[PDB]
Scaffold this motif. Structure first.
Motif, PDB file in Angstrom:
ATOM      1  N   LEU A 273      -0.027   8.605 -17.569  1.00  0.00           N
ATOM      2  CA  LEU A 273      -1.268   8.962 -18.034  1.00  0.00           C
ATOM      3  C   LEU A 273      -1.026   9.966 -19.314  1.00  0.00           C
ATOM      4  O   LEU A 273      -1.742   9.864 -20.330  1.00  0.00           O
ATOM      5  N   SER A 274      -0.394  10.599 -19.137  1.00  0.00           N
ATOM      6  CA  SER A 274      -0.148  11.790 -20.413  1.00  0.00           C
ATOM      7  C   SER A 274       0.775  12.631 -21.022  1.00  0.00           C
ATOM      8  O   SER A 274       0.842  12.921 -21.855  1.00  0.00           O
ATOM      9  N   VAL A 275       1.434  11.285 -21.581  1.00  0.00           N
ATOM     10  CA  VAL A 275       2.826  11.603 -22.494  1.00  0.00           C
ATOM     11  C   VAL A 275       1.725  11.286 -23.513  1.00  0.00           C
ATOM     12  O   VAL A 275       0.941  10.301 -23.860  1.00  0.00           O
ATOM     13  N   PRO A 276       2.279  12.312 -24.933  1.00  0.00           N
ATOM     14  CA  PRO A 276       1.455  12.268 -25.982  1.00  0.00           C
ATOM     15  C   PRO A 276       1.976  10.688 -26.899  1.00  0.00           C
ATOM     16  O   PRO A 276       3.188  10.063 -26.468  1.00  0.00           O
TER      17      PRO A 276
ATOM     18  N   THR B 203      -2.440   3.063 -22.967  1.00  0.00           N
ATOM     19  CA  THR B 203      -2.149   2.792 -21.917  1.00  0.00           C
ATOM     20  C   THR B 203      -1.142   2.639 -20.652  1.00  0.00           C
ATOM     21  O   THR B 203       0.123   2.086 -21.186  1.00  0.00           O
ATOM     22  N   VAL B 204      -1.485   3.058 -19.550  1.00  0.00           N
ATOM     23  CA  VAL B 204      -0.095   2.817 -18.158  1.00  0.00           C
ATOM     24  C   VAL B 204      -1.151   1.476 -17.333  1.00  0.00           C
ATOM     25  O   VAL B 204      -2.165   2.250 -16.562  1.00  0.00           O
ATOM     26  N   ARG B 205      -0.758   0.750 -17.547  1.00  0.00           N
ATOM     27  CA  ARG B 205      -0.576  -0.407 -15.917  1.00  0.00           C
ATOM     28  C   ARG B 205      -0.089  -0.344 -15.023  1.00  0.00           C
ATOM     29  O   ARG B 205       1.541  -0.130 -15.443  1.00  0.00           O
TER      30      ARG B 205
ATOM     31  N   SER C 154       7.934  -2.158  -7.702  1.00  0.00           N
ATOM     32  CA  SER C 154       7.140  -1.651  -8.589  1.00  0.00           C
ATOM     33  C   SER C 154       7.181  -1.129  -9.740  1.00  0.00           C
ATOM     34  O   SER C 154       8.151  -0.569  -9.968  1.00  0.00           O
ATOM     35  N   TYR C 155       6.132  -2.210 -10.868  1.00  0.00           N
ATOM     36  CA  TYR C 155       6.402  -2.574 -12.017  1.00  0.00           C
ATOM     37  C   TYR C 155       5.194  -1.682 -12.756  1.00  0.00           C
ATOM     38  O   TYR C 155       4.098  -1.033 -12.364  1.00  0.00           O
ATOM     39  N   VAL C 156       5.504  -0.676 -13.926  1.00  0.00           N
ATOM     40  CA  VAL C 156       4.787   0.641 -14.415  1.00  0.00           C
ATOM     41  C   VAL C 156       5.239  -0.287 -16.140  1.00  0.00           C
ATOM     42  O   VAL C 156       6.050   0.288 -16.496  1.00  0.00           O
TER      43      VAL C 156
ATOM     44  N   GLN D 252       1.117  -0.608  -0.236  1.00  0.00           N
ATOM     45  CA  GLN D 252      -0.389  -0.321   0.087  1.00  0.00           C
ATOM     46  C   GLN D 252       1.157   1.165   0.092  1.00  0.00           C
ATOM     47  O   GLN D 252       0.684   2.405  -0.630  1.00  0.00           O
ATOM     48  N   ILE D 253       2.180   1.189   0.573  1.00  0.00           N
ATOM     49  CA  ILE D 253       2.297   2.678   1.382  1.00  0.00           C
ATOM     50  C   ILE D 253       3.416   2.661  -0.543  1.00  0.00           C
ATOM     51  O   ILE D 253       3.802   4.071  -1.282  1.00  0.00           O
ATOM     52  N   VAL D 254       3.700   1.823  -0.654  1.00  0.00           N
ATOM     53  CA  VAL D 254       5.274   2.241  -2.465  1.00  0.00           C
ATOM     54  C   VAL D 254       3.436   1.835  -2.849  1.00  0.00           C
ATOM     55  O   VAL D 254       4.405   2.843  -4.038  1.00  0.00           O
ATOM     56  N   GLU D 255       2.637   1.747  -3.446  1.00  0.00           N
ATOM     57  CA  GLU D 255       1.481   2.264  -4.075  1.00  0.00           C
ATOM     58  C   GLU D 255       0.758   3.011  -4.336  1.00  0.00           C
ATOM     59  O   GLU D 255       0.859   4.365  -5.209  1.00  0.00           O
ATOM     60  N   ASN D 256       1.660   4.178  -3.066  1.00  0.00           N
ATOM     61  CA  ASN D 256       0.412   5.013  -2.917  1.00  0.00           C
ATOM     62  C   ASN D 256       1.432   6.637  -3.183  1.00  0.00           C
ATOM     63  O   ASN D 256       1.650   7.253  -3.441  1.00  0.00           O
ATOM     64  N   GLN D 257       3.007   6.019  -2.848  1.00  0.00           N
ATOM     65  CA  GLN D 257       4.329   7.038  -2.896  1.00  0.00           C
ATOM     66  C   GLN D 257       4.865   6.952  -4.108  1.00  0.00           C
ATOM     67  O   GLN D 257       5.537   7.407  -4.312  1.00  0.00           O
ATOM     68  N   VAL D 258       4.860   5.422  -4.929  1.00  0.00           N
ATOM     69  CA  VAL D 258       5.743   5.375  -5.482  1.00  0.00           C
ATOM     70  C   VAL D 258       5.000   5.045  -7.135  1.00  0.00           C
ATOM     71  O   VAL D 258       4.873   6.098  -8.066  1.00  0.00           O
ATOM     72  N   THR D 259       3.876   4.254  -7.336  1.00  0.00           N
ATOM     73  CA  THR D 259       2.785   3.682  -8.419  1.00  0.00           C
ATOM     74  C   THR D 259       2.110   4.725  -8.547  1.00  0.00           C
ATOM     75  O   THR D 259       1.827   5.003 -10.266  1.00  0.00           O
ATOM     76  N   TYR D 260       0.867   5.084  -7.550  1.00  0.00           N
ATOM     77  CA  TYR D 260       0.541   6.237  -7.839  1.00  0.00           C
ATOM     78  C   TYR D 260       0.243   7.696  -8.429  1.00  0.00           C
ATOM     79  O   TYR D 260      -0.280   7.742 -10.182  1.00  0.00           O
ATOM     80  N   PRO D 261       1.386   7.936  -8.208  1.00  0.00           N
ATOM     81  CA  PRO D 261       1.849   9.597  -8.997  1.00  0.00           C
ATOM     82  C   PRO D 261       2.936   8.604 -10.165  1.00  0.00           C
ATOM     83  O   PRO D 261       2.429   9.521 -11.522  1.00  0.00           O
ATOM     84  N   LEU D 262       3.888   8.007 -10.518  1.00  0.00           N
ATOM     85  CA  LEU D 262       3.655   7.448 -11.694  1.00  0.00           C
ATOM     86  C   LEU D 262       3.142   7.365 -12.683  1.00  0.00           C
ATOM     87  O   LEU D 262       2.528   7.164 -14.033  1.00  0.00           O
TER      88      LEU D 262
END
Lengths: 42, 301, 50, 51, 394, 100, 50, 50
Positions: free
Chosen positions: H31-34, H38-40, H48-50, H16-26
């Protein structure tokens, strides 16, 4: 377009005024100066 | 007009513009005056003193020139001069006092609390009663490393003065800008006279340079390029008219008669009260095209 | 006529872009650097209410 | 090098010139030598003889 | 040195190299940082100068500082200048010589000395105060500017005691840094100078003229008794090569005219060749500009033979026209007969020009350092021959 | 113009501090970026702006990449708590919508 | 080894746009030859002379 | 398809911590990259994989 006031009509009026002003001489030109200058082509 | 006449408050100079033009002008971090003299150096004092002279040096040459040095010196300061000797007397280095200056009085961030996806900063500061005025800073309690009770006036001197509100840097050097402006005239020749007068009646300090710029720098280019394509166009037109008639007389006649239609077109802008620009240029080009079409269709018949 | 056409040309004026009027406006006052945080809000409220 | 009657100016450099393109140690020497105009060198004295 | 394959965009390569550079900046030691090289190749160094002092007033440190903080920033503003790198001179530094005797006496280690030194060379400012309806913004001093400030640094202080200053433990002076590179003028003495680097694939003459004009305009603001002596410039070699090429081409044209005047018994048909040859080179240069291919010395030295190979068709056409116009003399529409006299040899010359033009593909074939170096020559030759074919047809 | 914006936010320092701490290194490092026509720096009360203006006819993405090329080399020299950020991918005609 | 004998940078003085390094080193007499390094004074954390 | 992988390492932090502080902002920034279709992204106990 010359007597109108809407959105972005300033540029349209600026672009149209020359043609409206010239449409009174270009006919006179092509009707009188062309034949005269052509009869004088020798 | 009603908006300007209604909103009236002391210390404001009203401007009413469009939002898009306002934003474009805000993002445009360039020079707006016609002519701009950039004085670059190693420090601010020398370039400021040099601009103070260049101002009147350029204001004397023939031609209206509202030479304004700059509007940057507008800040007010309360300088706390730390004395290394009086700070060593109590065993506190400069950083030991800067810590109190930035934390007790400044109130810098010292952490962030997490509440899910958010992050709220933490502040650590003294009360308001101890950091209200310079007289309160002169009595700011300080605890030395050896746990001694002293004040801030014992290791520093607090003084009030003025200064800049914003610092400009051109090419990573302190630079001073001077604006010379005119209206309804091409600034092509005054630049040379200004440069000559500055180079003759002004001396440069070691490590200082001067340069000129402004809108005219681009004009002298643009116009020039135009004069290279205006003839060419006519050429590419003449070669066509000839091909239409296989005789030079008709082409020359049409090219010499188009000016009459151009005259008829331009005689209306004055009555209308408009001003000639690139839009009027395209208008005149279209008018000339239609006039040439009329002339060709008439000569054929 | 082509010669008399030279009268308005000099008398005519030159502009870069005829100012286009939008549906909205932007009010911007030129002011001095010195200003606090509460006085700024007070001035903003006063100008908006005016 | 400056003793030759044809060289006009010599600029020697031992080491680097504070740039990533130059990586010469303190022992490697590079000396640029400018030669007088061909109309002043000497009677004859081609480049081979100069070198 | 990260070496890529052949045919790669240099900017693409730099971007790819940087894509992994940020991952390493965090693993290196504290004080060091990796920096990318300039945007120039081995042919980047175009201009070199030296700051000479014709007096005993300014030492090497002053010249080095002048070069680093005044000329480096004044010559970098040139549009197409990659970088101006300093060389020679001395880098002034503030040296603190410690004394082990005093260290043992006062009992103080080097770590505390460094901590005291780093804690006395900065400025700390608190948030702006709330004065009466106006804002005052604080600013505190603390920077080091003189040796007297260095002397009054306290390393160790005891409560109700006597503080220990830096002057009682060490000696502060101004000296030179460890020199990694030394430049020198003629045997007179040492000097300090700069080197201008040109961006990859740009005009060198324009940038050289720009930097020379800049130096001429800046020489006024230099100290008394300081001169800038140049030591190298590519403009001279390029001008010499261009002048040689122009002279050789003019001599070839004069030779063509002399031959046409000698063999045709003083007829100006030579003009037909003097106006038909340059247009071919014009077409070739247009085609070159349409695909970059900067003109090197080899591409310029090749046209001297291109014109000599092209003059053949013009000479043949002129001779055939002369022969037919002379044969007509034995016996509006006459010029139609001359057009026929021309067209009866036109196609043969056109096909000859086409084959001599297409016979240069084996030079575009080879690639590499030999291919990049010799490409422009064969390219300009092929384009010139094609233009000559077109002209001979017209 | 085709320009790039770099913003550095410092809470409570005077103009000279943010000029000689976060603005001076940024400017000195961006002055050597390929294709930049000029570099301007504005030091204010707490914030510092750096405008790198390129020549005309340059790809905005190319300019942003070239600017970022030298931004990483400066992140290690700035103060501890502050960090420089690149501006958005929009020009003065970017602001389209506003709500309250 | 690195500070007393090496003389690494320990700061930089600012004088406008320039930056001049600071050096912290022992005297020349104590770092002349290997025999001088074998006698380099050292002050232990507990203030002992060796 | 054109895929870009972003791996982040958070030593010893619950999903949860890594998802709120690392994965969520990334994931919200990528999602705004031209041209981003999709962004999984998934976060684990230490990565954390993106």
């Amino acid at each position: 377009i010359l007597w109108g006031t809407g959105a972005g009509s300033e540029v349209m009026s600026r672009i149209a005024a020359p043609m409206i002003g010239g449409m009174i001489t270009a006919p006179l030109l092509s009707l009188f100066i062309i034949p005269a200058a052509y009869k004088l082509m020798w | 007009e009603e908006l300007d006449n209604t909103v009236r408050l002391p210390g404001l100079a009203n401007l009413w513009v469009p939002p898009i033009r306002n934003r474009i002008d805000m993002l445009s971090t360039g020079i707006k005056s016609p002519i701009g003299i950039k004085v670059s150096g190693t420090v601010l004092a020398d370039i400021d003193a040099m601009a103070e002279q260049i101002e009147e040096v350029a204001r004397t040459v023939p031609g209206v020139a509202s030479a304004l040095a700059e509007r940057l010196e507008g800040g007010r300061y309360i300088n706390v001069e730390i004395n290394r000797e009086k700070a060593a007397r109590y065993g506190m280095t400069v950083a030991d006092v800067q810590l109190f200056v930035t934390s007790a009085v400044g109130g810098a961030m010292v952490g962030e609390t997490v509440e899910g996806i958010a992050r709220y900063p933490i502040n650590l500061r003294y009360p308001q009663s101890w950091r209200d005025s310079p007289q309160a800073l002169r009595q700011l309690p300080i605890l030395t490393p050896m746990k001694q009770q002293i004040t801030l006036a014992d290791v520093a001197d607090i003084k009030v003065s003025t200064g800049p509100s914003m610092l400009k840097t051109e090419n990573a050097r302190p630079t001073s800008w001077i604006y010379i402006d005119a209206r309804d005239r091409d600034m092509v020749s005054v630049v040379h006279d200004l440069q000559k007068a500055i180079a003759e009646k002004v001396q440069l300090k070691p490590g200082t340079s001067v340069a000129f710029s402004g809108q005219f720098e681009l004009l002298e280019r643009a116009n020039h390029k135009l004069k290279l394509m205006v003839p060419m166009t006519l050429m590419i037109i003449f070669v066509l008219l000839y091909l239409a008639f296989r005789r030079v007389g008709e082409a020359l006649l049409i090219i010499s008669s188009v000016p009459f239609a151009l005259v008829g077109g331009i005689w209306l802008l004055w009555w209308m009260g408009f001003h000639l620009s690139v839009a009027t240029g395209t208008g005149f080009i279209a008018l000339a095209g239609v006039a040439a079409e009329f002339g060709v269709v008439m000569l054929m018949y | 006529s082509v010669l008399t056409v030279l009268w308005p040309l000099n008398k005519v004026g030159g502009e870069f872009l005829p100012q286009i009027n939008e549906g909205d406006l932007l009010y911007m006052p030129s002011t001095l650097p010195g200003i606090s945080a509460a006085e700024a809000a007070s001035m903003l409220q006063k100008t908006d209410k005016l | 090098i400056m003793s030759v009657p044809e060289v006009a100016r010599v600029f020697g450099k031992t080491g680097k010139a504070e740039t990533a393109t130059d990586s010469a140690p303190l022992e490697m020497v590079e000396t640029t030598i400018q030669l007088k105009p061909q109309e002043q060198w000497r009677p004859g004295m081609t480049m081979d003889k100069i070198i | 040195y990260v070496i890529f394959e052949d045919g790669t965009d240099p900017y693409w390569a730099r971007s790819r190299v940087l894509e992994y550079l940020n991952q390493v900046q965090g693993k290196l030691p504290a004080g060091v940082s990796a920096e990318l090289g300039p945007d120039a190749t081995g042919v980047g160094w175009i201009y070199e100068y030296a700051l000479v002092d014709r007096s005993g007033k300014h030492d090497l440190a002053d010249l080095r500082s002048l070069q680093d903080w005044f000329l480096k920033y004044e010559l970098k503003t040139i549009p197409d200048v990659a970088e101006v790198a300093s060389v020679g001179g001395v880098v002034k530094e503030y040296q603190v010589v410690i004394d082990p005797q005093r260290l043992a006496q006062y009992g103080i280690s080097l770590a505390e000395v460094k901590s005291a030194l780093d804690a006395s060379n900065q400025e700390a400012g608190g948030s702006s105060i709330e004065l009466a309806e106006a804002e005052y913004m604080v600013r505190a001093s603390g920077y080091l500017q003189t040796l007297d400030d260095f002397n009054h640094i306290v390393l160790k202080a005891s409560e109700n005691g006597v503080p220990v200053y830096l002057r009682d433990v060490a000696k502060v002076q101004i000296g030179p840094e460890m020199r990694r590179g030394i430049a020198e003028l003629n045997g007179e003495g040492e000097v300090a100078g700069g080197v201008v680097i040109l961006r990859s694939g740009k005009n060198a003459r324009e940038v050289i003229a720009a930097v020379k004009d800049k130096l001429e305009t800046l020489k006024s603001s230099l100290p008394e008794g300081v001169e800038i002596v140049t030591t190298y410039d590519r403009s001279q070699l390029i001008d010499r090569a261009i002048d040689n090429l122009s002279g050789k081409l003019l001599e070839e044209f004069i030779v063509v005219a002399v031959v046409c005047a000698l063999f045709l018994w003083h007829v100006r048909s030579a003009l037909v060749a003097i106006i038909s040859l340059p247009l071919g080179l014009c077409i070739a240069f247009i085609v070159m500009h349409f695909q970059g291919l900067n003109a090197n010395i080899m591409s310029l030295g090749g046209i001297a033979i291109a014109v000599g190979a092209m003059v053949d068709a013009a000479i043949v056409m002129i001779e055939n026209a002369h022969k037919r116009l002379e044969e007509w003399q034995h016996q509006k529409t006459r010029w139609q007969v001359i057009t026929d006299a021309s067209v009866e040899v036109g196609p043969a010359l056109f096909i000859s020009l086409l084959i001599i033009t297409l016979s240069f593909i084996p030079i575009f074939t080879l690639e590499g350092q030999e291919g990049r170096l010799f490409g422009p020559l064969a390219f300009t030759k092929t384009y010139a021959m094609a233009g000559a074919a077109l002209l001979a047809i017209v | 113009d085709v320009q790039v914006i770099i913003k550095t936010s410092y809470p409570g320092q005077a103009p000279q501090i943010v000029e000689n701490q976060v603005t001076y290194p940024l400017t000195t490092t961006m002055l050597s970026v390929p294709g930049a026509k000029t570099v301007r720096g504005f030091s204010q009360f707490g914030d510092s702006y750096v405008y790198v203006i390129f020549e005309d006819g340059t790809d905005p993405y190319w300019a942003r990449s070239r600017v970022l090329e030298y931004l990483n080399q400066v992140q290690g020299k700035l103060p501890a708590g502050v960090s420089a950020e690149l501006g958005p991918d929009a020009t003065g005609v970017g602001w389209i919508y506003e709500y309250a």
